[PDB]
Every structure is written in C-alpha cells, then in structure tokens.
Symmetry: C3
Subunit: 168 residues, 3 copies
C-alpha cells in the first residue's frame, strides 16, 4: 500500500528502448533514474513509473503526477505515460537511509518524495489504470486514445519484451 522506489538496470532499459523509443534514458552517471512501483501487478507484470526532475514542462494531468514538498516546491513528476514492465532481477530497491548516508542532499529529496507519494498513491494507481486501459484498447481509437497512444510507451510491446526476457 506504500510506494517503493527502484532503480532499473541500464541493460534492461536499453533492451526495452529497442522496441519503443519512448522508454526513458536512464542517465546512470550519478543518480540512476528512480521509478515508483505500481502497487498491483498488471496482467502478471510488475510495472514501474519513472520520475523526472523536469518540473516545469507542459504535462497533461491524465498521464502525470506532480510531487510537491511541504513548502510547495516542485520535487519531481511521475510520468505514467512512460511506465514500463520490469522483471524482478533487473530492478533494485532503493534504501533511502543508505542513499542519505552516501549523498545527504539527494537522499533527503528522496525522503520528501516518499512522504508526498504515500499520501497520493491512490491518484497514481487511479491514473495508471485509466491510461493502461485506454492505450491497450482496440480497435478504433477515440480522440483521447489517439492522444494517449501517441504520448505513451507501447505497453503491449514492452510486455512481450518482458516475456522474452523470461528465458532465464
């Protein structure tokens, strides 16, 4: 019921972006892009929603969740349009206490993000279900479904790729 952050291996990310160019760059050079775990599986897949720090972009509310700290500063945006299915061997859980020891500023940011998300996980969940449903409909897309398909990863294609990974 309470969100867990994760980093995803750049190997698996690059492997996914082969099938869909909208998968987020991992930029693992200093802080590998954290993802939030969707609370329940979707069609047997563990899904993960990427965070971005590009807080001032034009986001449509249907595919994003803006995070705010107690003083109302923008502290990240969850991109539900770029959520991805990931196998449990290609993701690592983030220990905020650990991250705070290695990098005090960043770990504390992550704590703020955690405190915001545990109050707002209903909304993430809600949006995740609405867009997944609409992106995966067939066949003739409404006006909205066309927009969603354009701005979102090809979820079904990525699920196949996840399946293909399960040759291990």
């Amino acid at each position: 019921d309470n969100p867990k952050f994760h980093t995803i291996s750049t190997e698996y990310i690059d492997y996914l972006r082969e099938a869909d160019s909208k998968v987020p760059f991992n930029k693992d050079e200093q802080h590998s892009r954290p993802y939030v775990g969707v609370l329940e599986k979707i069609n047997g897949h563990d899904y993960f929603v990427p965070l971005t720090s590009r807080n001032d972009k034009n986001f449509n509310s249907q595919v994003s969740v803006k995070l705010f700290d107690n003083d109302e500063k923008r502290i990240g945006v969850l991109l539900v349009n770029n959520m991805i299915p990931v196998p449990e061997k290609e993701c690592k859980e983030i220990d905020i206490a650990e991250k705070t020891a290695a990098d005090p500023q960043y770990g504390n940011l992550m704590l703020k993000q955690y405190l915001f998300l545990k109050e707002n996980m209903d909304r993430v969940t809600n949006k995740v279900e609405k867009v997944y449903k609409d992106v995966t409909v067939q066949g003739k897309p409404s006006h909205k479904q066309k927009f969603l398909k354009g701005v979102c990863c090809d979820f079904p294609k990525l699920e196949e790729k996840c399946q293909e990974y399960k040759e291990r």
Copy 2:
C-alpha cells in the same frame, strides 16, 4: 442539485401581493429582484426564494440564509420567509454570462452568489422545508409557529393564487 437564479414578472408579483402584502417589491427599475429556485417542487408548485441586499438587518436564522464571498463580505440574504410559488411562464432564467456582458460588476456579483450557493444549497433546502411545514400546520400554533406565521408569506393563499393563474 445546483441552484438556478430567476427574475419574476412584475405582473405576477403584483398579482400575488394582492393576496399577501409580504410579497417582495420587485424593483425592476435597473435590476429586477433575483430569486433562487427551490430544488424540488412543493405540493406541485415551483417555489422561488427572493434575494435582498439589505445585508445588515436583524435576520432570524430560521428564515434566512446569509451569503458571503471569499473575502467574507456580505453578498445578499435569501429570505425564505418571503418564498413564493410561481408558474413557469411568469419567470425567466438568469444567464450570468449574459448579465456579466451587459453589466460587468453586477454579473460578477451574481457569479459570487452562485458559487456560494452551490456549496450551501443543503441549508436552503433544509430551512425551506422546516418553515413551510410550520407555517402550514394547523390548527393551534406553538410559540414558534406564531412567530413564523407572522413573519412569512401566507404560503397556502399564494398557492391558490398560483392555481387561479392556471386558467391559461
């Protein structure tokens, strides 16, 4: 479920005040007195509750609803004691956007009044039912019913007048 404002024809108002002198003067010279529509019919009649701008009078809470704007200024009082039954041909719906085009200050006041009322319509409804019941009881009036009868229009008499109008 959301309130609609109306103006009432001065012909019908004058016709009602023949039967009961407590019917409100319409003062149609610049802004004909707006009324709020009671959400549900009463004994088959559409009832309408008059607004007044006399915000500082001594009102008893049982027969009034004070409206306030976001900065807490007084912006009207609904006189449930002066509510009246009106046939649908003798009342016109108020288009706030239209009124705002013709008279920016007044139309905007009316918007504020609308925004307040849509949050407070339960209370209007509640008070409308309590006073209508008490005014129309028989036979021997309690202390309260005597007060209410004195300060309120003779609802049953006005309903008869409404019926008589239905010769059309």
Copy 3:
C-alpha cells in the same frame, strides 16, 4: 457523553492512599483536586481521573491526556495512571458557573478545560480501557504491563476498598 468534573472528599482519598500510595494528594487548601468522570462504569465502579497542573513533566502518552487551550497553552494533564474508583457519596459535582462566580480566573480555566475535554473524551475513554485492561491482567506481565503496573495505582485493591466502604 460529555465529561463532568468532580472533587473527591479528602477522607475517602486518605482512606484509599492507605491501600495504595500512588493515590493523588488532594491538596484541598484552596482548590481541591478536580477529577473527570469516566463515561461508563468499570466492573460496577464509578471511576474518576485526576487532573494535575504539572504540565511540563515527562508523561508517557499511554497513561495521560494533555489538555490545551485555544492559544495552545498547556492547561492540565489527566493522569489515567492515577484513576480511582469512588462511591457517589464521596464525590461532589463541580458547577463551573458557581466556581466562576467565587473565583473568576479559576472557574474560567475550568471552562477552557471543559471545552477541550468535550472534544477529546474519546481519547480519555480509549486510554482508560487500555490501561485498566493491562494493569489487571494476569499472570505473567509483558514488558509493557510491568511498566504500567509500576506507574499505575493498584486498581483491584482500590476496588476492594470501594466495596468495603459500602458498609453504609
């Protein structure tokens, strides 16, 4: 459902402290220590929870309720650890209006305490039940039950004393 304050006769208090030294000193010299009545009887006994003005002590939350006024000043602490069973002849109801006439400052303090408590009586009740249960368990006490037994009056012993009083 709404709390009543009481004073308890110093005779009965001294009689109780014979059996358990943790019973609160009554200090009846100017303002006899007020107690709040537990809303429901416990095993047939009327219980009363003492107030203290020692607002800055180290209290454990499990056995106390801190009272605050509207400006957030500390205005007493209910000691659920020192609650006692009292027969109805050894306690007097406090008339706050009366106390306010005799001693304006103190009576008004008591009003503030009343206004706080009527909003917080669920918590008093809640804590009263938890500690009474744990203090009166047997036989082998948990870590917590040992702490509670040490800091609380011997409720069962005081109940016997209450029974013994009923020779009247």
